[PDB]
Amino acid sequence: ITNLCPFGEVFNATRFASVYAWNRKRISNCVADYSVLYNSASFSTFKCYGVSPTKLNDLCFTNVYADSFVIRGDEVRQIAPGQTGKIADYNYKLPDDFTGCVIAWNSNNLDSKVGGNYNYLYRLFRKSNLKPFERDISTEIYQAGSTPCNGVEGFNCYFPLQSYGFQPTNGVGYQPYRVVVLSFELLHAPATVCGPKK
Amino acid sequence: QVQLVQSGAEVKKPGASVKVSCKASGYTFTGTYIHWVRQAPGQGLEWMGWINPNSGGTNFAQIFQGRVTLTRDTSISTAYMDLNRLKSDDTAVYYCARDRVLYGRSFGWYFDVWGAGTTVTVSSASTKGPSVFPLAPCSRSTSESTAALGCLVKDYFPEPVTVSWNSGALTSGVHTFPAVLQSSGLYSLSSVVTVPSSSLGTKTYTCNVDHKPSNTKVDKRVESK
């Protein structure tokens, strides 16, 4: 194989998914120069959960999925495997035996608007915490009250999604951070994504 | 090789509707918004609305809200714009344009890849072929040095008439002026050439006029009185 990975389409695409509806891209049949990503000072976080980031160029991967979404800066701590809080509980869970990378960078000049960019949402409510790599799109009205509810709204009933209000004057931690999670599997199956060893 | 391919020229009566189409290729059709932008004859651009081809969600400029309808067939990567109860100043070039896949802001619209544009003509006038008249200075003996001569193409409606001289053998010093839309709703244009007064005895000049909507190919020989 000789053609390079679509990392430009993953890391530089104009608009990312909302974290409740995190987008997945399958990477296959290509060369993956991870030194081009890892040497980049723009990533505020590049944490790997079953490999060293220096060794990624000496490995070949079974299948690779890149998961793309936007979150608040104080919530980037929740994307590590075994963490908990409304993002890890209700919209994006990693399994405790996750093998892969979490890569995150501040987007305040990209995702943040002087009137508030309300285009990005998270899941504020869910009957039960979601399973590893599940995604819940459903906008059924959540019921916090003891009585059942019907129609669009009620007392102690809530719309389950909430938008994040990103402004360029938000304090760091309330600014938007883009996340990419790379979720490969290693050395035990036939492989299709390759570090650039000849 | 990213591309947007549109339907050919549309011609319509007042109060009717028009269905412009925009076939995308070379990129994932669901990835980005498709905007609809129009441009009236000799005037600036005007944004009409967008469709998000993944969700089918749409937004419109207020002037078009309740007039324009935007739709899409993801199985054939085709976006559509339908414009209802057409008025004369809806005569315009209509473009679809894509919303920048990389490097932008997450809010921003842009228009990075544009389609070729579809001319819509909205008017009462029926299709009619041109009447082509010779233009010559005054008389042969009143000519001097470099002469000019031409043919005037008159009262024809389906826009795009093409004029050429001596079957395209003559192009030095040719003009074909932009058409004027007359008070009858029919178009007219003037096409003209400069030549030495000495060559009129050696050769003759023929303007050839092709009007595709009327299938009307007509040739006029131009002679000095």
Next chain:
Amino acid sequence: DIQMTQSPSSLSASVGDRVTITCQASQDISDYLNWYQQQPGKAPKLLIYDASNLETGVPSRFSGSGSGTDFTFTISSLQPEDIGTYYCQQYDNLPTFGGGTKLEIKRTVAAPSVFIFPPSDEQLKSGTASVVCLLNNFYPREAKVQWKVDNALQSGNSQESVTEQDSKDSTYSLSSTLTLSKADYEKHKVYACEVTHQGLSSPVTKSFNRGE
């Protein structure tokens, strides 16, 4: 809405001149502006985005600057492919365009060659008459045409079509057409057009009578 205005509605500029065109928004738009070029007879092309980010593969001469209500686009030294209409566009609230600035190549002054064309026998046989006044190869666009019959100035019954600027020598041409019924044509002896233009020392009259 956000209304946008561009300061030069057109700007004549020489090859190698520096061009500056300014766009002002009615509201404060921060840096939420794009700039597009439209060469004659093509769809627009995006050149600058986010008020100053130069797009992929466009010439390095193009620049954009400013933020807030007032913005600029610049060509550091103009080249003869840059000729077109330039439009600004806000993206703060529903993407409104500006009025557009036409560039054109600056040239030295030049006089119109003036011709006049009587109605043909085939045209008079249709029951209508039209007479054409042609101005060829001049540069300062603003040429004004006066139509007269029997020394009386005509109005509304004539219209004029102007070419785009000639790529070979940066010059314009136009004609005015005057139209009359077959009955209105025959009742006047003298038919004239007069051109007043910056490229002439004084106005020039072209005229004829029926017959010759």
